[PDB]
Design a binder for these strands. Structure first.
Ligand SMILES: [Ca+2]
Ligand SMILES: [Ca+2]
Ligand SMILES: [Zn+2]
Ligand SMILES: [Zn+2]
Lengths: 548, 344, 547, 345
DNA sequence: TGGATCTGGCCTG
DNA sequence: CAGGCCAGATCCA
DNA sequence: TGGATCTGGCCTG
DNA sequence: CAGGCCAGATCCA
DNA sequence: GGCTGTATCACTGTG
DNA sequence: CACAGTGATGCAAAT
DNA sequence: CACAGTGATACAGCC
DNA sequence: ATTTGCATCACTGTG
């Protein structure tokens, strides 16, 4: 006889839908005789414990501008937005959990992990000290989602997902704090818990803010409070630290009140122009923040010094909008890889034709360079040409074998050695801002990152004057200027990336196609609930019970 | 009553419901774009120009002493008479209400070039709470000009706001506010004849009276067919306000007003019920101490307009209204909205 | 318990991959302590029984140019096509079964089902009369299949699948023929057994012919022979009848000699030109065949009468190619529905603008009509505009409520009445060619189909004069001319459609990424094997344990 | 040895490896398109015109008595001297070999337009089996003209062919066949000096002899560096054929031959091994009874040619060679084949 | 002859 | 393949 | 002024 | 949205 | 001897 | 008249 | 240095 | 006084 919790864990992790599980249950019962599995109603009853809105909790001091009820689950994401014909038209569907309810559900899920960590850390068990929780929030817009038929608004064909994950939990003991919980796979799909799923265009600022405002309000309300939760027979308190890193460049620019991606001020961490970045490229410092952006927007709106458009833009450093989401300045490792590898692809394309001797070239010649590069890349590294470049392509193109293959087409040897040494420098610099812990497994690489960055900058500025004279990519600027400072500030780059958010994005389509009701008014509720169940950690150790 | 279609340039995705059209010396401008101001036009105002039924939204620069203002979504627009333009309230792209008054005027003009001057005005006293959808007019009583303000829609108070109902709105109180532009002072008044809230109404001004009619009250989810006349005098002491209820009003919300002839206006567009949409135009004739609303001929609406659910528009000033109809393409980009022009 | 056959049936029909089944088995064993689910090696050992190339069979007379081995399974679809650099390049991956072995395995999968069906007809159980089996073959190309990385040829991003279904099995008892095996859901994904999965383009002709030549050779060899099979302890004999109805118009035309898809000659069943088809539209006869196509191609190549190109084309009736697959002259119901509904969609769009009064209009006006129609449909029936129109859209669009909603956009009451009667006529026509057994499902609609045909033709000729003189569409010609003849020749039209092939295409899309190995050289074989397992009645009946 | 880029219009998706180019009074034409003939050009032949590095394929109509021959993918090319053109064998788009013989000629020509005359004949006697990759030439001995045929590649016989190895090919017998075009008769001849099969070879003709050199033998999977001279005389009685093995030959298969000067030929293209690709050119100095092969300078090959797998081409007739290089676009189509032209003095 | 007006290039997606 | 910003070639009153 | 040459429309996908 | 055929508007020697 | 378990191989997919 | 899902909800039947 | 598959094959382990 | 089974609702997906 199997328990309903075990049956639910199997049905969730083995990616089985309700209908398939029901027919498996009926055939197993009819053939074996005795009832091995459990009925769908039993599984449904056994899953309400894990969903948020079942466990009692009490905030102290009470959170501002939010209800104190502790029995709220899936609620409308529109948050009572006016849908009348006299108002701004709404065309979005959104279902969301309350932030505090989701966090208390996650904490009660990780209860036994926390207890095991306290036991293994040589501390006591019934300690109720001020537990500190570090939560990473990641957002990402999606495309190519097909709207369904049926009644409802003119929903767009794009989706935006908001998710959070729990990285570190600490408790204070004496004069120091111990490190009681760690996520073994911070970039996995099993850790990013969905929080709010909406079907809105990422560029539609009106509805984006309309749906994301209550979440930010709750975040600011609970940023300065204490949460008392009944945990294993002893009430324990919880503090929260919020870090938003899983935002790509476009989201950071849009939600931080910055300009578009091209612009002149390229970096989201320092207020330096593109020309100044191409002139120095090494020595910089992080200077942007949410409060600074708010003050700069206030200055832009007020115009207290009576300046023109260009002078006001120079004073405000490009902040022409009011930020509404607080994001910590950092670098997204996945998109950094994609951008750097695409730039390397263009470098190879230019180096095939020797642009350093032929400054003028035609579209046909560049297309022929594209064709020969694609042919030889396929021939050697077994890579097919792709119009929009992925991350596996970046990893397989960030090797010495592919640069040797490209050098098999470059007649000159100076270009061969230049590309070889530049590629070696890039491969030496990469493991610093990609490893989940770069102070332990790559100490020499972390120490030599600065020298390697200086060498890379000098090599670009000297040997590649036809590509990086007066202009350089913002991702190269970030990689060559800000990585060591971010390492010192945080502890790791890559553990805070958006790889887990991308994996959850992959899971979103599968859930929408297989484990959700095919209706425009319930699909996102079902997807959110199933994704929460899948990301729950109480249902994952039941599949790892064979190691006990 | 002539209806024609106007084409668009490459800025079609910049017009949303709730925009405002700004007139100076026969030239109409644009305000209330989509999203935060871009680098193509940091000011946010645009040169709304029509030649041979074609739209070209050219940018319009601001003065050195001007204040760059956010794109408001539902403000209160007035045309003070040395010609300036008063806007108060609205919604920012981040969906926060604003309680600030911006004053716009033409600072300097060149050959087909206009430079505006936006001035920030601060109000003291009984300042109205932030809101949108309301109306503002100006009255001239014995040589003194003062602005009148009426209620609209606003978010719930800070002590009764819950993130579950964060975006829920409630009608403002019917208190009438008299704001003085040259002094930046406001005095609130309570009128017994005004009991329910009112929003998305149309305001008609005269020498010393304001005619408010139509509008939607969210408390009862009804559109009353009322017609109120508000009279203001300016003695040496405090101003006195009297409101009188008059019969013969119409029941319409979010309608469009334009002036065809002196002492003559017309109501075009609006809503009758939640799903009912205003197909008739009421010709209002003004007088010294009398009001008279009459129904004129219905313009030849097209199938797209007749079978739609929403239109939005503003006033050109020269007896023309610029209304738009949403399209069903959306995903195919470009033609997200279908625009029309109406001649009175 | 849960024997390996039952465990394999569960794993296959619940869409569970090998890794996920391993996880479930491991956790169930760890928790319960017992061994409820069988291991993967036992599952594979039970798998080898159902796969082709395990049963002993003998052909008499022996098949021409076909090996006599009875232990052959997955073989390369190239069929020994040399990939030498000195000759024509090959850029295709294909894996296929030997078709006789596939037939034997399919026949033995339904062994107990045939026994039960023959018992239910008050016949004996050991009777070994010559069975007559009819097989419906379906081929359909695909697109937007992502090419994988790794070593191999420059494979295109298109796929072509070949599959067959066993529809009816009959035994000769006494003097008449009695119907033994009946397919309940002919258009289901559970009966479309795959045969050959080639990752190429159907537009390309050389590779398609090279890959499908051995299958046609085997079919021709087996069309004049008998198969002896040890079925249920008693040897039994089988004879086969082949029906190539699972093709669409484009594939049929590009296979059996006809030119393009839109030309002067329109129908694949008769030699009728477009103009006289529009003129007459009601009276026709089926004339085209495969031997006739071969003779016409021979005449075209030889030019015996010394004729010019135009009159030679007139004499050969558009046949300018050598056919290589015998296709039954039928109508594909799904694509017929899609085409007819799309044409009525554009007729609605065209009637919105009162074109019968305004002959000339601009592309802006056409786009205006399109936008108005799309917006009104979305407002009323909650549909959405789609670039390419599908069967669900066709079914939702062809209802009387469609003309009821559209009539609110057109002012003319005469146009309202005309559109309403057009919709009524089409709705009365549809079940005749959409029903799997019209003789016992809609005899009332079957008897007056001809009268409905004249009414429809008259309406198109008169009330829609502005479009239907000098031209009429392929599928309307088919529907108004050839449906009764096909329905009296065969018995049904919808049972011989490509719905099962489309469902198999969906299954292939799911399997290529969910439960197949990820490598260019050994993924077609895995997909073919898993699809063959999924389309097995022996495994399917383990999910129907209610008695 | 000048290599120059050539572009193609809206018919670039019509050229495949194995096409044949025919020259008629200074105008070169195209044959062997992709797929069955369409309504744009039912005849199948095209006007292969290159002007200012632009290739435009215009349809060419046939005569009233012409035969609409299928597009053959690998036939044998001969130029009978009243200037005719003879093709034998090949692969149809449905992938079956043809044992039929076709004769092409210009029936009537007016300003910028030509009508061809395709004539069908039947061979009797020791008719060769259907095959592809072979070579056919004509000899002029004692005032009588007669064609010569050599082995190539063909499918397995009808008694040993199975569906598992249906498309497997085997080299034809080394037998040498003499074809009499005016009478349509063929006589077999077995030569002891020829023991292994040969395919994808090049043939050079003279007054009364044919020089076959290079080629691939499928039986041993080798490319011999052999060279045979086949001399034929035509007395009143039966014809006599003699084959003599000569040294100094080259090892190449599927090479391209062109007509540079009188008694002067050059060979370009081909393959040496499966992955080895012929980068050198051999000049053949013809003579009365002497043959001398010399290697000239290598033409300035481009990166795309030097780093490819295959090329294919034919002879324009006027000392020009038209070869193409495949591209990796495919999905984008359009530039599915990159074409080049080569000039030999 | 000095601002408008497209226009290609480049940056992130 | 879209969207936005910027340097560059026309260009017209 | 009578065939070349694009070009939009229509058929199946 | 891609391919193929056909009737129609230019158009050029 | 025979059943069961686990590493290995070149890849995918959301970006 | 394609057919097998898709899951929450509700009521009838079984223990 | 993203991480959880993905299925066949072969060798190690245990009774 | 529960637990279990099966219909119902508007949809999808390969076309
Ligand atoms: Ca993304
Ligand atoms: Ca298809
Ligand atoms: Zn920076
Ligand atoms: Zn017909």
């Amino acid at each position: 006889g199997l328990q309903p919790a075990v049956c639910l864990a199997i049905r969730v992790n083995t990616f089985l839908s309700c209908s398939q599980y029901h027919k498996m249950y009926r055939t197993v019962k009819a053939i074996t005789g005795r009832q091995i599995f459990q009925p769908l109603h039993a599984l449904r009853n056994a899953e309400k414990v894990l969903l948020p809105g079942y466990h009692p909790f009490e905030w102290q001091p009470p959170l501002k501008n939010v209800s104190s009820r502790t029995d709220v689950g899936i609620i409308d994401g529109l948050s009572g937005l006016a849908s009348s014909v006299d108002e701004y038209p709404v065309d979005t569907i959104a279902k969301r959990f309350r932030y505090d309810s989701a966090l208390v559900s996650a904490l009660m899920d990780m209860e036994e992990d926390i207890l095991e960590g306290m036991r293994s850390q040589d501390l006591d068990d019934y300690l109720n000290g001020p537990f500190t929780v570090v939560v990473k929030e990641s957002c990402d817009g999606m495309g190519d989602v097909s709207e369904k038929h049926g009644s409802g608004p003119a929903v767009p064909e794009k989706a935006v997902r908001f998710s959070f994950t729990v990285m570190r939990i600490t408790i204070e003991h004496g004069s120091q704090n111990v490190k009681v919980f760690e996520e073994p796979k911070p970039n996995s799909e099993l850790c990013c818990k969905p929080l709010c799923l909406m079907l809105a265009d990422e560029s539609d600022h009106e509805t984006l803010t309309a749906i994301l405002s209550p979440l930010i309000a709750e975040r600011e309300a609970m940023k300065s409070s204490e949460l008392t939760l009944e945990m294993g027979g002893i009430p324990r308190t919880f503090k929260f630290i919020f870090r938003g890193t899983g935002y790509d460049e476009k989201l950071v620019r849009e939600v931080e009140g910055l300009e578009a991606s091209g612009s002149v001020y390229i970096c989201t961490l320092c207020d330096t122009t593109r020309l100044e970045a191409s002139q120095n490229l090494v020595f910089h410092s992080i200077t942007r923040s949410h409060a600074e952006n708010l003050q700069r927007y206030e200055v832009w709106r007020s115009n207290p010094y009576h300046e023109s458009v260009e002078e006001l833009r120079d004073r405000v450093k490009g902040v022409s909008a009011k930020p509404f989401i607080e994001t910590v300045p950092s670098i997204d490792a996945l998109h950094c890889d994609i951008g750097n590898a695409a730039e390397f692809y263009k470098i190879f394309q230019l180096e095939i034709g020797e642009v350093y001797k032929h400054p003028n070239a035609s579209k046909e010649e560049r297309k022929r360079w594209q064709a020969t590069l694609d042919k030889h890349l396929r021939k050697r590294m077994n890579l097919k040409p792709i119009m929009r470049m992925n991350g596996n392509f970046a990893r397989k193109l960030m090797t010495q074998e592919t640069v040797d293959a490209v050098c098999e087409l470059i007649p000159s040897e100076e270009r061969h050695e230049a590309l070889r040494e530049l590629m070696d420098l890039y491969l030496k610099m990469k493991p610093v801002w990609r490893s989940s812990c770069p102070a332990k497994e790559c100490p020499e690489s972390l120490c030599q990152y600065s020298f390697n960055s200086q060498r890379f900058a000098e090599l670009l500025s000297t040997k590649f004057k036809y590509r990086y004279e007066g202009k350089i990519t913002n991702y190269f600027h970030k990689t060559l200027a800000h990585v060591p400072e971010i390492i010192e500030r945080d502890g790791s780059i890559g553990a805070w990336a958006s790889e887990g958010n991308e994996s959850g994005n992959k899971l979103f389509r599968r859930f929408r196609k297989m484990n959700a009701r095919q209706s425009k008014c319930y699909e996102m509720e079902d997807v959110l609930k199933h994704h929460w169940l899948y990301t729950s950690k109480y249902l994952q150790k039941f599949m790892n019970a064979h190691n006990a | 009553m002539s209806l024609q279609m106007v084409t668009v340039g490459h800025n079609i995705a910049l017009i949303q419901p709730g925009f405002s059209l700004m007139n100076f010396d026969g030239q109409v401008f644009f305000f209330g774009q989509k999203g935060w101001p871009k680098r193509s036009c940091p000011t946010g105002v645009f040169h709304f120009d029509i030649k041979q039924n074609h739209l070209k939204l050219k940018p319009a620069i601001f003065s050195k002493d001007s204040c760059y203002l956010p794109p408001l979504r539902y403000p209160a627009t007035c045309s003070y008479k040395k010609h300036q333009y008063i806007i108060h309230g609205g919604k920012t792209p981040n969906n926060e209400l604003s309680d600030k008054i911006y004053i716009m005027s033409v600072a300097c003009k060149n050959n087909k070039k206009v430079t505006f001057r936006c001035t920030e005005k601060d109000l003291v006293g009984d300042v109205p709470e932030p809101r949108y959808g309301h109306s503002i007019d100006v009255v001239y009583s014995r040589g003194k000009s003062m602005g009148v303000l009426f209620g609209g829609r606003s978010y719930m108070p800070s002590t009764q706001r819950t993130t579950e109902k964060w975006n829920s709105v409630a009608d403002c109180l019917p208190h009438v506010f008299l704001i003085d532009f040259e002094f930046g002072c406001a005095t609130s008044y309570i009128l017994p004849e005004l009991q329910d809230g009112l929003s998305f109404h149309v305001s008609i001004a005269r020498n010393d009276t304001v005619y408010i009619l139509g509008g939607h009250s969210l408390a009862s989810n009804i559109r009353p067919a009322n017609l109120y006349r508000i009279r203001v005098d300016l003695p040496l002491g405090t101003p006195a306000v009297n409101c009188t209820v008059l019969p013969g009003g119409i029941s319409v919300s979010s309608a469009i007003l334009t002036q065809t002839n002196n002492d003559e206006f017309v109501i075009v567009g609006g809503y009758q019920l939640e799903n009912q949409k205003r197909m008739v135009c009421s010709l209002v004739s003004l007088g010294d101490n009398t009001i008279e609303i009459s129904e004129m001929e219905t313009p030849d609406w097209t199938s797209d307009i007749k079978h739609s659910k929403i239109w939005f528009g503003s006033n050109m000033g020269n007896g023309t209204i610029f209304l738009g109809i949403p399209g069903d393409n959306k995903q195919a980009m470009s033609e997200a909205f279908y625009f029309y022009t109406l001649r009175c």
